[PDB]
Ligand binder design. Sequence first.
Ligand SMILES: CCCCCCCCCCCCCCCCCCC(=O)O[C@H](COC(=O)CCCCCCCCCCCCCCCCC)COP(=O)(O)O[C@H]1[C@H](O)[C@@H](O)[C@@H](OP(=O)(O)O)[C@@H](O)[C@H]1O
Ligand SMILES: CCCCCCCCCCCCCCCC(=O)O
Ligand SMILES: CCCCCCCCCCCCCCCC(=O)O
Lengths: 385, 385
Amino acid sequence: AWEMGVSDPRKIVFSAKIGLALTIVALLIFYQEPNPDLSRYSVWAILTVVVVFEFTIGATLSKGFNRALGTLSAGGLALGMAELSTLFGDWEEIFCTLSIFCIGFLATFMKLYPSMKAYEYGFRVFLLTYCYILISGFRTGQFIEVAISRFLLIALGAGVSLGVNMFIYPIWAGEDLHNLVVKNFMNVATSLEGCVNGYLRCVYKGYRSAVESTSQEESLMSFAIWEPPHGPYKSFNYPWKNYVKLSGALKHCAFTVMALHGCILSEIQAPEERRQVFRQELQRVGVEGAKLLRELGEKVKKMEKLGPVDLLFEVHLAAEELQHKIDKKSYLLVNSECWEKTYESASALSLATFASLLIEFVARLQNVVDAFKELSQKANFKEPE
Amino acid sequence: AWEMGVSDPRKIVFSAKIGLALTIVALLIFYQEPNPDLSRYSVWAILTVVVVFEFTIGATLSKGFNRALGTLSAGGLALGMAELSTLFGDWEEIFCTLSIFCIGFLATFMKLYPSMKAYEYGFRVFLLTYCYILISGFRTGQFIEVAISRFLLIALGAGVSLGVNMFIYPIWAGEDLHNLVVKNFMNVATSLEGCVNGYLRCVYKGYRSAVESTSQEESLMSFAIWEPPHGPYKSFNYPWKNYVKLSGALKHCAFTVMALHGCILSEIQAPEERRQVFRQELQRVGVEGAKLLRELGEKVKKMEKLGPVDLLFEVHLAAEELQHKIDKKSYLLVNSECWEKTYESASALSLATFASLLIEFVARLQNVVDAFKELSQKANFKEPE
Ligand SMILES: CCCCCCCCCCCCCCCCCCC(=O)O[C@H](COC(=O)CCCCCCCCCCCCCCCCC)COP(=O)(O)O[C@H]1[C@H](O)[C@@H](O)[C@@H](OP(=O)(O)O)[C@@H](O)[C@H]1O
Ligand SMILES: CCCCCCCCCCCCCCCC(=O)O
Ligand SMILES: CCCCCCCCCCCCCCCC(=O)O
């Protein structure tokens, strides 16, 4: 509560902004000219305020657009059907209930398509609007004024919500994707160091977050294309997709770290005295990889180009040293007596797996640098000092 | 559309059930005994059906409970504050709009906790009810008479929805958990066979679904605790948690299959002619593993206990034969000339990784059998024919 608000003060301004918009609309309702008609449906502007206030600008715009589409299409259909029903003078309510059944069937079937799972909020407003408009206009006609009057209040509430959200300490979604990339870049290096240290002893959140955030970064990329230029991101079509390409290149590397972590939890393990022979070569690779990943993260954070010096020299040298060391002592991994128990042989063979997975990670490192170079070319990154 | 319906005929009955409930409510609203007030709020009963109709019984029962909690607490608070406001006679609107501000702030702050992410639908009902009751009773008193009528309409709509859902071809969430476990059991075996065949060539959906459905198996289990006894599951407290334990035991095995699939996409790979030496031993393990997993899935499906014979004899024998074969021809994995380039050495060493991962999978198989035995003990499974 108090602790969570203290740690993140972004969540205490949003609640106050929502309260401020609600207070504004409440005052505008309470202090108004005594017009008898609207006081029976003036409660709609505050429900619109409650329903259309979202955390980010891009989400607000995109979901308001979808809700408006649904409302307007449902209203058009309801008006058309109500106009048509008059022909069947003897059976008007029968026709209305038969239209309600069919529309409810169709609207419920079309929302169960798996590819429309993220738009379930826009299929509810369609059915609500159709049913409300059809049932509320049956008596005494009055179909076309039970729509304009209740749509103008919705417009007013949406305008108030948009103004308050957009003109007072706004939160953007592109700066959230920009920060998420940097966080993943640091988590992966922490995980790698932890795994190597744990194996060499006499880790999970990092690669888990680096391998389980594809949908978060895609929702964030779908919210960031609605927002206008601001701050450092001065351009009409900012390439938000190259960030996702870099994230995928990094996740491909994180898979190997996940396999290395799985190596520790294995039922079959190698003796300690055999592990201790390769300590320094195994540790140097992890040190160099962590340094490279942190350097790439810092360069991404400040929007800077790569320098002239090669970044993969040291880790490649360490990997070649590791290969030479493995070649020199390969007689500890296999047994030559049987050349032409089983648990001991499996334990002896289980160390080559760890070494080969480390070498595979080092080999995979280069796609990330290629993707970073492409992204820094697409967006105008500053020349390094 | 039509293809989706023909593939899955369960989605054509849900859509007709919703339509039928809507039609019933519409008929009751269109053929009602003339009433002065009730006729102006009849529409409140046809939107409840839209809002509370869910795919499964338990979800409908868990979410209606929470929605009722939110609505009742909001109504109580609104009535209390309306009674309280009378003391400040000079400034009534100011007090009302200040309590609106405070309630909006607190309700927005309490829903941003990370542990209340799945209950966002109940924090909206609270604010909507509070604001509606406060704003609708300001003129002409009438605070305790605008609640009972609309809550009777809400109750009627919810009752119609519940009756239609529970008395016409219901869908249960425990038969969905029970089906999901069997599906994972078959997907994993298909993935394993595909991976082995692909590596020996001269796989993704299986382990992907077996490793990414933990939340589905927890949501279905939280829905299935509300449902009364029915069909084969005759008991007051059915052990739905042993299914989750078995699923986790299977996921621990699926991790190594994912690693084996990853070994195929590596940058460093071994020559084909050297792989071909171990073909039969590599294929026998996959065949036996697939057969065992399919046997376990079939026995889970029919709710039957394991027989007296040991199910892990053949796979253990195949693993031992593979280990002997590797021990006999170990000189193709290392190079002894250097005993005291790197690309070819890494390629040669990359095959021991595959063999060791296969042996680790065989080693991990036994916890799944332990979990199955425990589950078949906890629930009364039929003795084998
Ligand atoms: C012949 C014709 C030819 C064509 C010509 C053109 C003619 C077309 C004319 C078009 C005019 C049509 C306008 C018709 C007005 C009728 C609207 C009725 C309606 O919209 O229906 C009810 C109504 O309710 C009420 O009281 C009012 C509540 C307000 C609704 C606002 C919804 C959003 C509107 C669209 C988007 C706006 C923004 C657009 C951008 C604009 C920028 C300026 C909906 O309710 P709701 O959305 O608030 O839903 C609740 C639910 O009620 C809870 O219970 C919760 O439940 P839970 O999920 O459990 O938390 C949640 O679900 C929660 O969403
Ligand atoms: C806009 C006015 C109509 C609103 C209709 C949707 C209201 C959603 C609230 C659901 C409350 C469900 C309470 C269950 C009642 C019960 O049977 O005990
Ligand atoms: C937008 C409309 C939301 C639905 C709110 C309709 C009112 C239903 C809830 C009123 C229940 C009030 C009961 C309070 C009795 C008490 O606990 O003292």
